[PDB]
Write a protein that binds this ligand. Structure first.
Ligand code: APR
Ligand code: APR
Ligand code: MG
Ligand code: MG
Ligand code: MG
Ligand code: MG
Lengths: 179, 174
């Protein structure tokens, strides 16, 4: 796996390093697939332009005052105006990893929404600036395993993921709920 | 999966069930990064089981394959799917539980396709049977792997990957 960095460590890296920020947006979901399988949470990912599943967010530049401003800017471009109903903050920060690209550090955040907030993000996503360009569409992460022992989560994890998105996902699944 | 003619597939026992699915596509003059022609917007969807597939479902009280296909498309995609009708002339192939999988490709305008994406979260199956729609990237990036080739490494239901690839070449979407 990619090297874990401390946040402070990462921010003290030279001007040549680029920082990228992504967020896992999630909300409790009381629904039940087929009326019997608890969904537990609605968690959003997206199909990226490169054919991989990822988390919304993107590069932070010099014109971004903080990691969190860059992140929220990128979420707005990628998810649309309903993203503005909330702010992902330093309290939502979970991890930093050395990126595979030359001198990239990947910061990961997890942000609890209400189901109504998450729903509004989904409903407006096709109006996002990057819908149909960087973002090919949003998908929810299935948290259940189906009665055949493979359908659902284990099969979702078999898709292609960008960077550390798979690891970032699994760690949040453990950390957060008993998912 | 075993290929068969439609007339062939239509003569089978009630033991046999029929499923229909559609690839909705529209020309897209856009360019990713202002540089990469997108060519077509093609819809696929992430299913409850964590696999990519095409919208559609089991034919059942359905007068024909087509009635069954559009009935299911509306349930999965929502009201904007009622703006058009997938017909026998959009038929592509049939493939053989004892289920036979019929595959259709239906051309829309970009605006009709966009309306489908825009209303899909409202659909009956959204958040349950369907986890969200995605477009199929048709370009290959400069690294020779990003885009379609990586897309095709994802998990697919049934014959979806093969039905995709046959449509991409036969309708000359590449
Ligand atoms: N979850 C992740 N974990 C680790 N690394 C990641 C993750 N997600 C992305 N990366 C890395 O960071 C890079 C940038 O992430 P994006 O989300 O794609 O950034 P964004 O600013 O939204 O746009 C990417 C830009 O890169 C150019 O290739 C292209 O012009 C595009 O505009 C990716 O190419 C990838 O290597
Ligand atoms: N593109 C495809 N090619 C071949 N087979 C397919 C394809 N898509 C689906 N199938 C198969 O057809 C069957 C059902 O397809 P769905 O699209 O899921 O049909 P729908 O009517 O929406 O089904 C309701 C769902 O309830 C679940 O209990 C059950 O697993 C079924 O998928 C499954 O056996 C699935 O493997
Ligand atoms: Mg971006
Ligand atoms: Mg991005
Ligand atoms: Mg269905
Ligand atoms: Mg279906």
């Amino acid at each position: 796996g990619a090297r874990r960095l401390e946040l402070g460590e990462a921010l003290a890296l030279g001007s040549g390093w680029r920082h990228v920020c992504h967020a896992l947006l999630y909300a409790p979901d009381p629904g039940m697939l087929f009326g019997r399988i608890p969904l537990r949470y609605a968690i959003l990912m997206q199909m990226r332009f490169d054919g991989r599943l990822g988390f919304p967010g993107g590069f932070v530049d010099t014109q971004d005052r903080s990691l969190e401003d860059g992140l929220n800017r990128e979420l707005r471009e990628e998810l649309g105006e309903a993203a503005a109903a909330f702010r992902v903050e330093r309290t939502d920060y979970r991890s930093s990893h050395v990126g595979s690209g030359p001198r990239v550090v990947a910061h990961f955040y997890a942000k609890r929404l209400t189901l109504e907030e998450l729903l509004a993000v989904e409903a407006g996503a096709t109006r996002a600036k990057d819908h149909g360009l960087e973002v090919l569409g949003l998908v929810r992460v299935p948290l259940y395993t189906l009665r055949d022992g493979v359908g659902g989560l284990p099969t979702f994890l078999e898709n292609s993921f960008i960077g550390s998105a798979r690891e970032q996902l699994l760690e949040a699944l453990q950390d957060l709920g008993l998912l």
